[PDB]
Design a protein around this ligand. Structure first.
Ligand code: RSY
Lengths: 99, 99
């Protein structure tokens, strides 16, 4: 798709057998999702850094479908105001900024 | 340009007679820049909301050049860890997400 930016670029994703919505966020290095039980191995990761850090679970090589595009990438799972698709998965789906 | 997202989408801007760098951030509703003296009228605005709010100065209808595209838009000026071009000015330059 070509997504204009008059509204927040929220897309449908499928992850861990669930449908969810997430924000395509070119300001975010990493993808951070709230409340998903993913199977397989993880390690704790400290993110943010303003006011303290937030600890999330880092799952590598997670299959995820983003606006119909089936890809693989690292997903951080933990508390986030909104589900965010970061650059790490936008590269995988071949998403570019164009003007 | 077509900008891939393997690296942070940092671009050159010209604002208030200065050259600066800023991050094209589709997760940000608004444009927030640090340390610019803009002429003309402003009003205080509270932004953020996590941990408290941050107060910035809102300047409406500011001429700004973004990666060579001369546009007009609202610029919030105050303390930010990174200069950020938000959706409000990405729409003006005709920037879309494509995949
Ligand atoms: C270092 C900490 C500030 C947090 C850390 N930050 C980052 O990764 C980067 C800056 Cl290093 N943040 C961003 O790029 C801002 C980002 O677009 C996030 C979007 C988001 C992410 C997660 C949940 C809810 C919303 N925030 C914003 O765009 C905006 N928030 C802001 O504080 C803000 C400040 C200055 C300029 C623009 N925006 C707002 C519209 C919500 C993180 N792990 O998310």
């Amino acid at each position: 798709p070509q997504i204009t930016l008059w509204q927040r670029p929220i897309v449908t994703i499928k992850i861990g057998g669930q449908l969810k919505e997430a924000l395509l966020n070119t300001g975010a290095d990493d993808t951070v999702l709230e409340e998903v039980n993913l199977p397989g191995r993880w390690k704790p990761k400290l993110i943010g850094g303003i006011g303290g850090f937030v600890k999330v679970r880092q799952y590598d090589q997670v299959p995820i479908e983003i606006c119909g595009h089936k890809v693989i990438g690292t997903v951080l799972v933990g508390p986030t105001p909104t589900n965010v698709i970061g650059r790490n998965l936008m590269t995988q789906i071949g998403c570019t900024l164009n003007f």
